[PDB]
Amino acid sequence: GKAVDGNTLVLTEEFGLVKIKELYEKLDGKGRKTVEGNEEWTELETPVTVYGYRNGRIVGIKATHIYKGISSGMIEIRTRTGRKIKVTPIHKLFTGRVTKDGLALEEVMAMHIKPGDRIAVVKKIDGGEYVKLTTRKIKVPEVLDEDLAEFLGYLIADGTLKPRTVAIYNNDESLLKRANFLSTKLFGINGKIVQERTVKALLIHSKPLVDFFRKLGIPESKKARNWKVPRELLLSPPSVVKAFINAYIVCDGYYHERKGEIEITTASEEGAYGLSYLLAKLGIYATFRKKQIKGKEYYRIAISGKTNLEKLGIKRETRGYTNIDIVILFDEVVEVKYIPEPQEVYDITTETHNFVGGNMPTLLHN
Protein backbone atom coordinates (compact mmCIF):
# COMPACT_ATOMS: atom_id res chain seq x y z
CA GLY A 1 0.00 0.00 0.00
CA LYS A 2 0.84 3.70 0.27
CA ALA A 3 2.79 4.04 3.51
CA VAL A 4 5.98 5.35 5.13
CA ASP A 5 9.01 4.12 7.01
CA GLY A 6 8.59 3.67 10.75
CA ASN A 7 11.20 6.31 11.61
CA THR A 8 9.17 9.01 9.77
CA LEU A 9 8.36 11.73 12.27
CA VAL A 10 4.74 12.90 12.52
CA LEU A 11 3.55 16.08 14.20
CA THR A 12 0.77 15.32 16.71
CA GLU A 13 -0.92 17.51 19.29
CA GLU A 14 -1.07 14.79 21.97
CA PHE A 15 2.48 13.43 21.66
CA GLY A 16 4.41 16.18 19.94
CA LEU A 17 6.78 15.19 17.15
CA VAL A 18 6.98 11.38 17.32
CA LYS A 19 8.11 8.56 15.06
CA ILE A 20 5.11 6.99 13.35
CA LYS A 21 6.16 3.52 14.58
CA GLU A 22 6.03 4.79 18.16
CA LEU A 23 2.70 6.51 17.59
CA TYR A 24 1.46 3.17 16.21
CA GLU A 25 2.70 1.20 19.21
CA LYS A 26 1.17 3.72 21.63
CA LEU A 27 -2.27 3.58 19.97
CA ASP A 28 -2.32 -0.03 18.70
CA GLY A 29 -5.60 -1.60 19.78
CA LYS A 30 -7.18 1.54 21.29
CA GLY A 31 -10.31 1.10 19.21
CA ARG A 32 -11.59 -1.46 16.71
CA LYS A 33 -8.61 -3.48 15.48
CA THR A 34 -8.49 -5.60 12.34
CA VAL A 35 -5.74 -8.00 11.26
CA GLU A 36 -5.80 -9.24 7.66
CA GLY A 37 -2.76 -11.23 6.63
CA ASN A 38 0.36 -9.09 6.76
CA GLU A 39 -1.74 -5.95 7.38
CA GLU A 40 -3.36 -4.54 10.50
CA TRP A 41 -5.09 -1.37 11.57
CA THR A 42 -6.99 0.20 14.44
CA GLU A 43 -9.99 2.44 13.95
CA LEU A 44 -9.26 4.69 16.91
CA GLU A 45 -11.86 5.05 19.65
CA THR A 46 -10.89 8.72 19.73
CA PRO A 47 -9.04 10.19 16.71
CA VAL A 48 -5.57 11.62 17.20
CA THR A 49 -4.95 15.15 16.01
CA VAL A 50 -2.24 15.51 13.36
CA TYR A 51 -1.63 18.34 10.89
CA GLY A 52 -2.70 18.53 7.30
CA TYR A 53 -3.57 20.78 4.39
CA ARG A 54 -7.10 22.20 4.35
CA ASN A 55 -8.37 25.32 2.57
CA GLY A 56 -4.87 26.60 1.86
CA ARG A 57 -3.60 26.23 5.47
CA ILE A 58 -1.71 23.60 7.48
CA VAL A 59 -3.95 23.03 10.52
CA GLY A 60 -4.90 20.43 13.10
CA ILE A 61 -6.99 17.63 11.59
CA LYS A 62 -8.31 14.27 12.76
CA ALA A 63 -6.52 10.98 12.11
CA THR A 64 -9.06 8.19 12.46
CA HIS A 65 -7.01 5.04 11.74
CA ILE A 66 -3.47 3.77 12.28
CA TYR A 67 -2.08 1.14 9.94
CA LYS A 68 0.86 -1.27 9.87
CA GLY A 69 1.87 -3.30 6.83
CA ILE A 70 4.69 -4.72 4.70
CA SER A 71 6.21 -3.34 1.52
CA SER A 72 8.55 -5.23 -0.79
CA GLY A 73 10.79 -2.20 -1.35
CA MET A 74 11.09 1.47 -0.43
CA ILE A 75 12.11 4.78 -2.02
CA GLU A 76 14.25 7.21 -0.05
CA ILE A 77 14.17 10.82 -1.25
CA ARG A 78 16.55 13.58 -0.13
CA THR A 79 16.00 17.28 -0.93
CA ARG A 80 18.17 20.39 -1.03
CA THR A 81 16.85 21.62 2.32
CA GLY A 82 18.01 18.37 3.98
CA ARG A 83 14.65 16.61 4.18
CA LYS A 84 14.93 12.85 3.84
CA ILE A 85 11.77 10.74 3.62
CA LYS A 86 11.49 6.99 3.10
CA VAL A 87 8.20 5.79 1.61
CA THR A 88 6.66 2.91 -0.32
CA PRO A 89 7.15 3.08 -4.11
CA ILE A 90 3.45 3.82 -4.76
CA HIS A 91 3.31 6.56 -2.09
CA LYS A 92 2.03 9.68 -3.82
CA LEU A 93 4.05 12.88 -3.56
CA PHE A 94 2.89 16.34 -4.62
CA THR A 95 5.40 17.91 -7.01
CA GLY A 96 5.82 21.35 -8.51
CA ARG A 97 7.51 22.06 -11.85
CA VAL A 98 8.80 25.42 -13.10
CA THR A 99 7.75 25.49 -16.78
CA LYS A 100 7.59 27.85 -19.75
CA ASP A 101 4.37 29.49 -18.59
CA GLY A 102 4.47 28.86 -14.84
CA LEU A 103 4.16 26.34 -12.02
CA ALA A 104 2.42 22.98 -12.46
CA LEU A 105 1.26 20.74 -9.61
CA GLU A 106 0.76 17.00 -10.06
CA GLU A 107 0.89 13.89 -7.90
CA VAL A 108 3.74 11.50 -8.68
CA MET A 109 4.46 8.09 -7.21
CA ALA A 110 7.66 8.04 -5.16
CA MET A 111 9.10 5.41 -7.53
CA HIS A 112 8.87 7.91 -10.44
CA ILE A 113 10.59 10.80 -8.58
CA LYS A 114 13.97 11.90 -9.96
CA PRO A 115 16.63 14.40 -8.86
CA GLY A 116 15.52 17.81 -10.12
CA ASP A 117 11.87 17.19 -9.26
CA ARG A 118 10.48 19.38 -6.48
CA ILE A 119 8.20 18.05 -3.73
CA ALA A 120 5.72 19.86 -1.50
CA VAL A 121 7.10 20.96 1.86
CA VAL A 122 5.56 22.97 4.67
CA LYS A 123 6.73 26.53 5.29
CA LYS A 124 4.01 27.54 7.81
CA ILE A 125 2.10 25.53 10.46
CA ASP A 126 -1.02 27.25 11.88
CA GLY A 127 -2.42 26.93 15.38
CA GLY A 128 -1.17 27.28 18.89
CA GLU A 129 -2.82 28.24 22.16
CA TYR A 130 -1.20 29.12 25.49
CA VAL A 131 -0.66 25.76 27.14
CA LYS A 132 -1.92 25.26 30.67
CA LEU A 133 0.61 23.43 32.85
CA THR A 134 -1.02 21.17 35.44
CA THR A 135 0.47 21.40 38.96
CA ARG A 136 11.11 24.48 49.76
CA LYS A 137 8.25 26.15 47.91
CA ILE A 138 8.46 27.62 44.43
CA LYS A 139 5.69 29.05 42.35
CA VAL A 140 4.93 26.73 39.46
CA PRO A 141 3.89 28.63 36.32
CA GLU A 142 0.34 27.79 35.26
CA VAL A 143 0.85 28.72 31.58
CA LEU A 144 3.73 28.26 29.16
CA ASP A 145 4.13 31.91 28.21
CA GLU A 146 6.92 33.90 26.58
CA ASP A 147 8.95 34.29 29.79
CA LEU A 148 9.03 30.55 30.42
CA ALA A 149 9.74 29.80 26.75
CA GLU A 150 12.70 32.19 26.86
CA PHE A 151 14.04 30.48 29.99
CA LEU A 152 13.53 27.06 28.34
CA GLY A 153 15.60 28.25 25.39
CA TYR A 154 18.57 29.06 27.64
CA LEU A 155 18.14 25.79 29.51
CA ILE A 156 17.86 23.55 26.45
CA ALA A 157 20.70 25.32 24.61
CA ASP A 158 23.22 25.84 27.41
CA GLY A 159 21.80 24.23 30.55
CA THR A 160 21.80 20.98 32.51
CA LEU A 161 19.59 19.26 35.06
CA LYS A 162 21.05 17.49 38.08
CA PRO A 163 18.92 16.15 40.98
CA ARG A 164 19.37 19.29 43.10
CA THR A 165 20.41 21.99 40.62
CA VAL A 166 19.28 23.75 37.46
CA ALA A 167 22.39 25.15 35.76
CA ILE A 168 22.99 27.44 32.76
CA TYR A 169 26.53 27.59 31.35
CA ASN A 170 27.41 30.71 29.34
CA ASN A 171 30.21 33.27 29.53
CA ASP A 172 27.83 36.21 28.95
CA GLU A 173 26.97 37.46 32.43
CA SER A 174 24.16 39.62 31.06
CA LEU A 175 22.58 36.43 29.71
CA LEU A 176 22.99 34.71 33.09
CA LYS A 177 21.49 37.74 34.82
CA ARG A 178 18.52 37.68 32.45
CA ALA A 179 17.96 33.98 33.17
CA ASN A 180 18.19 34.73 36.90
CA PHE A 181 15.63 37.54 36.57
CA LEU A 182 13.32 35.12 34.74
CA SER A 183 13.81 32.53 37.49
CA THR A 184 12.67 35.06 40.09
CA LYS A 185 9.67 36.22 38.05
CA LEU A 186 8.56 32.68 37.10
CA PHE A 187 9.49 30.57 40.13
CA GLY A 188 9.96 33.08 42.94
CA ILE A 189 13.52 31.87 43.60
CA ASN A 190 16.87 32.86 42.17
CA GLY A 191 20.32 31.39 41.79
CA LYS A 192 23.95 32.47 42.01
CA ILE A 193 26.39 33.27 39.21
CA VAL A 194 29.57 31.24 39.66
CA GLN A 195 32.92 31.13 37.86
CA GLU A 196 33.68 27.51 37.03
CA ARG A 197 36.94 26.16 35.62
CA THR A 198 35.72 26.38 32.01
CA VAL A 199 32.78 28.82 31.88
CA LYS A 200 30.55 31.01 34.01
CA ALA A 201 27.39 29.41 35.33
CA LEU A 202 24.13 30.38 36.95
CA LEU A 203 23.28 27.68 39.53
CA ILE A 204 19.76 27.43 40.96
CA HIS A 205 19.48 24.86 43.77
CA SER A 206 15.88 23.60 43.84
CA LYS A 207 14.74 19.99 43.52
CA PRO A 208 11.13 21.14 42.77
CA LEU A 209 12.44 23.27 39.91
CA VAL A 210 14.41 20.36 38.46
CA ASP A 211 11.26 18.22 38.79
CA PHE A 212 9.29 20.90 36.92
CA PHE A 213 11.67 20.76 33.97
CA ARG A 214 11.91 16.97 34.11
CA LYS A 215 8.12 16.86 33.79
CA LEU A 216 8.46 19.04 30.66
CA GLY A 217 10.73 16.36 29.18
CA ILE A 218 14.19 17.88 29.67
CA PRO A 219 16.58 14.91 30.14
CA GLU A 220 18.78 14.57 33.22
CA SER A 221 21.55 12.62 31.47
CA LYS A 222 22.92 12.62 27.92
CA LYS A 223 20.99 15.85 27.37
CA ALA A 224 23.30 17.17 24.64
CA ARG A 225 22.66 14.15 22.41
CA ASN A 226 19.05 13.32 23.36
CA TRP A 227 16.99 16.45 24.06
CA LYS A 228 13.70 16.91 22.17
CA VAL A 229 11.39 19.85 21.67
CA PRO A 230 8.68 19.59 24.36
CA ARG A 231 5.22 18.87 22.97
CA GLU A 232 3.98 21.90 24.93
CA LEU A 233 6.16 24.22 22.83
CA LEU A 234 4.91 22.63 19.61
CA LEU A 235 1.36 23.48 20.73
CA SER A 236 2.18 27.06 21.74
CA PRO A 237 1.31 30.36 20.00
CA PRO A 238 3.93 31.70 17.55
CA SER A 239 4.92 34.45 20.02
CA VAL A 240 5.86 31.77 22.58
CA VAL A 241 7.77 29.70 20.00
CA LYS A 242 9.63 32.84 18.92
CA ALA A 243 10.72 33.66 22.48
CA PHE A 244 12.15 30.12 22.74
CA ILE A 245 13.87 30.26 19.31
CA ASN A 246 15.46 33.67 19.92
CA ALA A 247 16.69 32.54 23.34
CA TYR A 248 18.26 29.43 21.78
CA ILE A 249 19.90 31.52 19.02
CA VAL A 250 21.25 34.03 21.59
CA CYS A 251 22.95 31.09 23.31
CA ASP A 252 24.26 29.14 20.32
CA GLY A 253 23.53 31.01 17.10
CA TYR A 254 26.08 32.23 14.58
CA TYR A 255 25.50 34.77 11.83
CA HIS A 256 27.36 34.59 8.51
CA GLU A 257 27.33 38.20 7.32
CA ARG A 258 27.95 37.36 3.64
CA LYS A 259 25.75 34.28 3.23
CA GLY A 260 23.15 36.17 5.26
CA GLU A 261 22.26 33.14 7.38
CA ILE A 262 21.82 32.29 11.05
CA GLU A 263 23.31 28.92 11.94
CA ILE A 264 22.83 26.74 15.00
CA THR A 265 24.63 23.45 15.57
CA THR A 266 23.28 20.92 18.08
CA ALA A 267 24.43 17.44 19.14
CA SER A 268 20.77 16.26 19.24
CA GLU A 269 19.44 14.98 15.92
CA GLU A 270 15.82 14.87 17.08
CA GLY A 271 16.29 18.26 18.74
CA ALA A 272 17.37 19.70 15.40
CA TYR A 273 14.34 18.20 13.63
CA GLY A 274 12.04 19.65 16.32
CA LEU A 275 13.57 23.10 15.82
CA SER A 276 12.57 22.89 12.12
CA TYR A 277 8.96 22.29 13.13
CA LEU A 278 9.10 25.20 15.61
CA LEU A 279 10.51 27.41 12.84
CA ALA A 280 7.65 26.37 10.52
CA LYS A 281 5.20 27.50 13.21
CA LEU A 282 6.82 30.92 12.62
CA GLY A 283 6.59 30.57 8.83
CA ILE A 284 10.39 30.19 8.57
CA TYR A 285 11.79 27.57 6.21
CA ALA A 286 15.07 26.12 7.49
CA THR A 287 17.80 23.95 6.01
CA PHE A 288 19.35 20.93 7.73
CA ARG A 289 22.81 19.33 7.33
CA LYS A 290 24.73 16.68 9.21
CA LYS A 291 28.32 17.76 9.84
CA GLN A 292 31.32 15.77 11.04
CA ILE A 293 33.21 18.10 13.39
CA LYS A 294 36.23 16.93 15.42
CA GLY A 295 35.43 13.28 14.79
CA LYS A 296 31.79 13.51 15.89
CA GLU A 297 28.47 14.03 14.11
CA TYR A 298 26.51 17.24 14.65
CA TYR A 299 23.27 18.59 13.26
CA ARG A 300 23.15 22.05 11.72
CA ILE A 301 20.00 24.17 11.29
CA ALA A 302 20.37 27.26 9.10
CA ILE A 303 18.00 30.17 8.41
CA SER A 304 18.76 32.18 5.23
CA GLY A 305 17.28 35.13 3.37
CA LYS A 306 15.71 38.38 4.47
CA THR A 307 12.17 36.96 4.44
CA ASN A 308 13.12 34.21 6.89
CA LEU A 309 15.38 36.32 9.09
CA GLU A 310 13.06 39.30 9.48
CA LYS A 311 10.49 37.01 11.12
CA LEU A 312 12.92 36.55 14.04
CA GLY A 313 13.27 40.29 14.64
CA ILE A 314 11.73 41.87 17.71
CA LYS A 315 11.07 45.04 15.70
CA ARG A 316 9.41 44.29 12.35
CA GLU A 317 7.92 46.25 9.47
CA THR A 318 4.19 46.25 10.05
CA ARG A 319 3.31 44.60 6.74
CA GLY A 320 5.25 41.51 7.85
CA TYR A 321 2.13 40.84 9.92
CA THR A 322 -0.51 41.67 7.30
CA ASN A 323 1.29 39.80 4.50
CA ILE A 324 -0.18 36.36 5.02
CA ASP A 325 2.27 33.59 4.25
CA ILE A 326 2.26 31.19 1.39
CA VAL A 327 2.15 27.89 3.20
CA ILE A 328 3.65 25.33 0.79
CA LEU A 329 7.02 25.51 -0.99
CA PHE A 330 8.53 23.14 -3.54
CA ASP A 331 11.88 21.61 -2.51
CA GLU A 332 14.30 20.24 -5.13
CA VAL A 333 15.14 16.51 -4.88
CA VAL A 334 18.89 15.89 -4.91
CA GLU A 335 19.07 12.13 -4.37
CA VAL A 336 16.78 9.17 -4.88
CA LYS A 337 17.62 5.75 -3.51
CA TYR A 338 15.88 2.50 -4.47
CA ILE A 339 15.83 0.02 -1.58
CA PRO A 340 14.74 -3.55 -2.47
CA GLU A 341 14.76 -4.91 1.12
CA PRO A 342 11.27 -5.64 2.54
CA GLN A 343 10.20 -4.02 5.79
CA GLU A 344 7.27 -2.97 7.94
CA VAL A 345 5.59 0.30 6.92
CA TYR A 346 3.04 2.55 8.62
CA ASP A 347 0.21 4.88 7.68
CA ILE A 348 -2.34 7.10 9.34
CA THR A 349 -5.74 7.81 7.81
CA THR A 350 -6.84 11.44 7.97
CA GLU A 351 -9.92 13.37 6.91
CA THR A 352 -7.86 15.34 4.34
CA HIS A 353 -5.93 12.24 3.09
CA ASN A 354 -2.69 14.10 3.81
CA PHE A 355 -0.57 14.78 6.89
CA VAL A 356 2.61 16.59 7.88
CA GLY A 357 5.70 14.53 8.62
CA GLY A 358 9.36 13.91 7.87
CA ASN A 359 12.52 15.08 9.60
CA MET A 360 11.53 18.59 8.51
CA PRO A 361 7.88 19.43 7.78
CA THR A 362 6.75 17.73 4.54
CA LEU A 363 3.33 17.12 3.02
CA LEU A 364 2.72 13.36 2.89
CA HIS A 365 -0.28 11.55 1.40
CA ASN A 366 -2.50 8.69 2.64
Residue numbers in the entry: -1 to 133, 141 to 371
Question: Can you quote the paper on this entry?
Answer:
Inteins catalyze their removal from a host protein through protein splicing. The HINT domain catalyzes the protein splicing reaction, whereas HEN domains often function independently of the HINT domain. In this study, we elucidated crystal structures of HEN-associated archaeal inteins inserted at the same insertion site (VMA-b), which is located within the A subunit P-loop of the vascular-type ATP synthase (VMA) from Thermococcus litoralis (Tli) and Pyrococcus horikoshii (Pho). The two three-dimensional structures highlighted a modular architecture consisting of HINT, HEN, and an accessory domain (ACD).
To investigate the structural and functional roles of ACDs in HEN-associated inteins, we decided to delete the ACD region from the TliVMA intein based on the three-dimensional structure. We could also validate our deletion design by determining the crystal structure of the deletion variant, termed TliVMAΔACD intein. The crystal structure of TliVMAΔACD intein confirmed that the deletion of the ACD did not influence the HINT and HEN domain folds, nor their relative orientation toward each other. In the DNA cleavage and binding assays, TliVMAΔACD intein similarly cleaved the same substrate as the wild-type TliVMA intein did, albeit with reduced DNA-binding. To our surprise, the deletion of the ACD from the TliVMA intein changed the cleavage profile. The substrate cleavage profile by TliVMAΔACD intein resembled that of the PhoVMAAct intein, producing two main products as opposed to three products generated by TliVMA intein. The DNA sequencing chromatogram of the smaller cleavage product generated by TliVMAΔACD supported that TliVMAΔACD intein did not cleave the alternative site as observed for the wild-type TliVMA intein, similar to the digestion pattern of the PhoVMAAct intein. The DNA substrate containing only the alternative cleavage (AS) site (intein coding sequence remained inserted into the homing site) indicated that only TliVMA intein bearing the ACD was capable of digesting the DNA substrate, whereas TliVMAΔACD intein was not. These results revealed that the TliVMA intein cleaved the alternative site (AS) independent of the homing site (HS) but depended on the presence of the ACD domain. Furthermore, similar to our model DNA substrate, deletion of the ACD in TliVMA intein indeed reduced cleavage of λ-phage DNA, supporting our hypothesis that the ACD renders the intein endonuclease more promiscuous.
